RNA sequence: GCUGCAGUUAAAAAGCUCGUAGUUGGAUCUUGUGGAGGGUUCCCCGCCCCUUGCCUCUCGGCGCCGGCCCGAAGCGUUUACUUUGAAAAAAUUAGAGUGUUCAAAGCAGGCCCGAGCCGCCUGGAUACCGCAGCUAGGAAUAAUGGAAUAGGACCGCGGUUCUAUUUUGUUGG
RNA sequence: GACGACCCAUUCGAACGUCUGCCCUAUCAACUUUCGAUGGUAGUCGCCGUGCCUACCAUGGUGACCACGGGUGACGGGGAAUCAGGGUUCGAUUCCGGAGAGGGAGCCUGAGAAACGGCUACCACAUCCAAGGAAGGCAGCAGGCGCGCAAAUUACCCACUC
């Protein structure tokens, strides 16, 4: 079957980090088309009945979205399979709560509640600079927003703080060694550490070393690096564990050390 | 040994073994498939036919007996096989020009015991087994 | 001919040890053979050895005891990858408590117990026990 | 060489123009050719022979249009008699997990040869690089030739 | 029957030799001393000539008092080999956690309070994933390799031929 | 607020292309070429690259490292059974990719189809008819016939999952 694009998605080929079961039926939600990559998305309904358990059936989530209590990036969305991804803020204004989508140290989108103050902006990577007609420059970001007239000194692999309401960036970082970074793709995920070094090749990818403040060195491809703030100075509130990432032996030891699994 | 043991002699080994495997007896029946084509079965465990005529086969020496076989033609290949009738007096429970169900002896293409030319036996005469006819758990339906 | 120098050397020392000889004559010398016999001496399976010099390829004379049992060559020279090591070490040694398969690595020629502590595989040469 | 036209259709460089514009020795130049070339990039070197020379070819990447991007490979010459192309060979070793031996296998591939290089001979080492298709059996072009690295073709006694 | 078979008589070496492909192929081109990690010499800096071979430098930091020193830039003839990274769909398999009433399974679940807790805590690991391709370190082993009726080296010079546009505010000679 | 539309970016893909990897057979050893084989030059065509196609021109391409030809109770892979180590055999079948709707060919609509629960024709089948004509494709769920050693209910329902 290949006379056009498919529309079903199974459960057993579903991207594994949404933590689905398999004794519910064959299908899984499928992200609809949008700004983030299909693998990198967390569909809306999985945050609302397969995490926080406001709803219990998919029809219930549709009944929440219809009354429009949900926002994403300060605008109103009303699908059940809206494709939100990394660095967005969800905002329920009927609870007074704001969430942030960020990577756990085990590489899955966690619940990271935040102040309303922080929830007025997000961190956006620059990917492309493109001169349009009549000599105007542009930015292009991973959340796929086109912000016209950027000041010229911003280059790709940099990051920019965006004001959700108005565009028109507040600050930026210029990519270099000794800046604090998060990993967003690759087999490493959610790890935090300073850049330390870069390496360039002519075509065919290139890699970027990273080192943290716990004395571990690891590397990742260039295009999986994301900047979060100046050296040892995050401009976001980080979820617990701080991207350090333990081994399984040490992690076991903590649970049996406090002797705690309930409270 | 008596053979090359280079570090670049993978070809001369892997082509030699693929050739000298054809001289093996088991392999040569399995992979030419002439076994199947020649067999009155398609390679199925059983087969079904219709009786032609009772016969008796006189056993190979030193044993002397009459072994009360049948001869049957098959449905699914239209060719003829001479088939043993097991237990005692189950010749009587077979009646001519009816269907039967046949089955191999248990030695895979080779006559068993002192009876020659018979590589098959009989299990059902009319959806009723020779076991159940003999024991009396069922009865011939007339 | 003599396509494997190491293979012709060891068979001599094998044959000689059986008869009970405690001096032998091995030719041709090669540097590879020297470092081989060095390892075999350190552990204490054989004694001191004398390299006679010519201007051809040398000849070697050895002093040995009955401690040696069997040194073999493995031809051709396979690779080992430090998980393949254990599979080898089972096959060539009569015990888990003694015997040393020898090999060469980029860190030089050594026994297997030592090679595992350098954390480098390499090409296998022979064995002994 | 001075004449390279011999075809039914006129042969020329695109991206070059001929003026009628005035000069003190006109009309209108002194050879009517300002030569075109471009770099390959990547770190491979441009040849003198192109910038000096006169030839029309479009499948060479020095003077023509065709990018080199993706893979890079090598080979050696085995045969040639074809027009602006050659055949080459790639020896390599295939492993078998059932045994522990290797064995030899080779493929042959054609690749286009620039009119820039005019010094090639059988058995010369060559390097090549991935391109968009040029022809049915050509996917590559030469970037560089090298020889005298193993069995020289000449000797010094001068 | 690679690991791991057999060929005098039990089945079995071409009558014999030559010979291209294939397979396989001799020797030969470096050792000692203080500090550091482990013994009582031996296995990250250096020293005898070498030590991650060099320069050349110039642009953007570190220094010390215009002047001087050392990291990054071309790389050590090429491969294999070995060692580390990157990179890899899930289910299955190995395997951590959880009394399914036990198990096969499953991915859950666990805490204190009469009615005042209107709530709290925590999991959903990890391993392996042939090849072939990408990256860095090692340099023994095996291939490949530098001047032999020379060209290697130093800002050593000549002759010959061609040529760059940068700067003297601009444009021409 | 709702709707529509143009271009660029993005998402979902799609399509071509690189390198490496495949079961048996030599009682298959030479094969391929103007009925294009390999290459060159220009053009045609196509969403684009390309002997994809045409004109003109060149004479090549591949092979004992097994081509070419023939065979396969061969859909491919993730896997499965047995097993000390090394292996052997199986994989129609829930995931992923491909191919096809009786056999062939052509085509409309659309962003997307050489679609068959769309259309047009032939060939093979088979139905109705006032004999003038008309209509059809269960390798969708049930069910029946036939084939055979060999395989289920003409059930209930959108509550769950989508």
């Amino acid at each position: 079957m290949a006379r056009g694009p498919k529309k079903h998605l199974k459960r057993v080929a579903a991207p594994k980090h949404w933590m689905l079961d398999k004794l519910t039926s064959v299908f899984a939600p499928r992200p609809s088309t949008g700004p983030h990559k299909l693998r990198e998305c967390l569909p809306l309904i999985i945050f609302l009945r397969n995490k926080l358990k406001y709803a219990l059936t998919g029809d219930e989530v549709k009944k929440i979205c219809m009354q429009r209590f949900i926002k994403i990036d300060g605008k109103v969305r009303a699908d059940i399979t809206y494709p939100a991804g990394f660095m967005d803020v969800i905002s329920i204004d009927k609870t007074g709560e704001n969430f942030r989508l960020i990577y756990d140290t085990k590489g899955r989108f966690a619940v990271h509640r935040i102040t309303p103050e922080e929830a007025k902006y997000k961190l956006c990577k620059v990917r492309k600079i493109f001169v349009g007609t009549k000599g105007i420059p542009h930015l292009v970001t991973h959340d796929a927003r086109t912000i016209r007239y950027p000041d010229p000194l911003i280059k790709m692999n940099d990051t920019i703080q965006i004001d959700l309401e108005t565009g028109k960036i507040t600050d930026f970082i210029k990519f270099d060694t000794g800046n604090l970074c998060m990993v967003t793709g690759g087999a490493n995920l959610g790890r935090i550490g300073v850049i330390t070094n870069r390496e360039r090749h002519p075509g065919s990818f290139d890699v970027v070393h990273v080192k943290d403040a716990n004395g571990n060195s690891f590397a990742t491809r260039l295009s999986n690096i994301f900047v979060i703030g100046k050296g040892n100075k995050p401009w976001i509130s980080l979820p617990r564990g701080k991207g350090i990432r333990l081994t399984i032996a040490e992690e076991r030891d903590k649970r049996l050390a406090a002797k705690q699994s309930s409270g | 040994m008596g053979k090359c043991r280079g570090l670049r002699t993978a070809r001369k080994l892997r082509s030699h073994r693929r050739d000298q495997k054809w001289h093996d007896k088991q392999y040569k029946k399995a992979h030419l498939g002439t076994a199947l084509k020649a067999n009155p079965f398609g390679g199925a465990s059983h087969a079904k036919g219709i009786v032609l005529e009772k016969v008796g086969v006189e056993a190979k020496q030193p044993n002397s007996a009459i072994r009360k076989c049948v001869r049957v033609q098959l449905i699914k290949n239209g060719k003829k096989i001479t088939a043993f009738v097991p237990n005692d007096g189950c010749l009587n429970f077979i009646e001519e020009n009816d269907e039967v169900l046949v089955a191999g002896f248990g030695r895979k293409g080779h006559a068993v015991g002192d009876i020659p030319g018979v590589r098959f036996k009989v299990v059902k005469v009319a959806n009723v087994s020779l076991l159940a006819l003999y024991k009396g758990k069922k009865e011939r339906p007339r | 001919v003599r396509m494997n120098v190491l293979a012709d050397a060891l068979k001599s020392i094998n044959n000689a040890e059986k008869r009970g000889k405690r001096q032998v004559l091995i030719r041709p010398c090669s540097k590879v053979i020297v470092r081989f016999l060095t390892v075999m001496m350190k552990h204490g399976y054989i004694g001191e050895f004398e390299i006679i010099d010519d201007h051809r390829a040398g000849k070697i004379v050895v002093n040995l005891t009955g401690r040696l049992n069997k040194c073999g060559v493995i031809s051709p020279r396979f690779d080992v990858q430090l998980k393949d090591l254990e599979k080898w070490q089972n096959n060539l040694l009569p015990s888990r408590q003694f015997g040393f398969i020898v090999l060469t690595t980029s860190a030089g020629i050594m026994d297997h117990e030592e090679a595992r502590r350098k954390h480098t595989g390499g090409k296998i040469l022979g064995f002994f026990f | 060489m001075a004449d390279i036209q011999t075809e039914r259709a006129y042969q020329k460089q695109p991206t070059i123009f001929q003026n009628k514009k005035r000069v003190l020795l006109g009309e209108t130049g002194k050879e009517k050719l300002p030569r075109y070339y471009k770099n390959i990039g990547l770190g491979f070197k441009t040849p003198k022979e192109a910038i000096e020379g006169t030839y029309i070819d479009k499948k060479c990447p020095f003077t023509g249009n065709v990018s080199i991007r993706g893979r890079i490979l090598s080979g050696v010459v085995t045969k040639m008699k074809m027009q602006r192309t050659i055949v080459i060979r790639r020896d390599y070793l295939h492993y078998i997990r059932k045994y522990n031996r290797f064995e030899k296998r080779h493929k042959n591939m054609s690749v286009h040869l620039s009119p820039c290089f005019r010094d090639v001979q059988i058995g010369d080492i060559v390097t090549v690089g991935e391109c968009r298709p040029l022809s049915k059996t050509v996917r590559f072009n030469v970037l560089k030739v090298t020889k005298a690295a193993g069995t020289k073709k000449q000797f010094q006694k001068f």
Side-chain angles (χ1 to χ4, degrees), chain A residues 9-11 14-21 27-32 38-58 61-62 65 70 79-84 90 101 108-111:
Chain A
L9 183 62
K10 303 294 185 182
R11 188 171 289 262
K16 185 62 181 297
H17 64 299
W18 302 351
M19 304 184 289
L20 299 178
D21 61 301
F27 302 112
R30 195 176 182 86
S32 298
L38 189 151
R39 305 296 186 84
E40 195 185 287
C41 291
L42 181 61
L44 189 63
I45 182 168
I46 313 182
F47 201 72
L48 301 178
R49 76 174 186 83
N50 299 302
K51 283 288 189 296
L52 296 172
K53 305 187 287 77
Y54 290 123
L56 293 174
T57 58
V61 181
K62 185 62 177 181
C65 301
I70 311 182
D79 298 302
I80 53 169
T81 46
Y82 191 80
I90 303 177
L101 294 171
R108 56 193 189 201
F109 292 107
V111 182

Side-chain angles (χ1 to χ4, degrees), chain D residues 74-89 108-115 117-128 137-146:
Chain D
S74 302
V76 62
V77 181
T78 186
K79 183 181 293 184
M80 52 189 177
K81 185 53 179 63
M82 299 160 70
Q83 300 164 271
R84 300 179 175 164
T85 181
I86 56 178
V87 183
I88 56 170
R89 182 168 178 150
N108 295 102
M109 51 182 64
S110 296
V111 44
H112 168 274
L113 176 66
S114 190
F117 294 101
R118 289 293 172 168
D119 43 74
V120 294
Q121 188 57 252
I122 306 293
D124 282 49
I125 318 300
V126 56
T127 55
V128 295
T137 62
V138 181
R139 302 291 191 241
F140 301 102
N141 289 320
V142 170
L143 293 172
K144 186 175 64 58
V145 181
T146 186

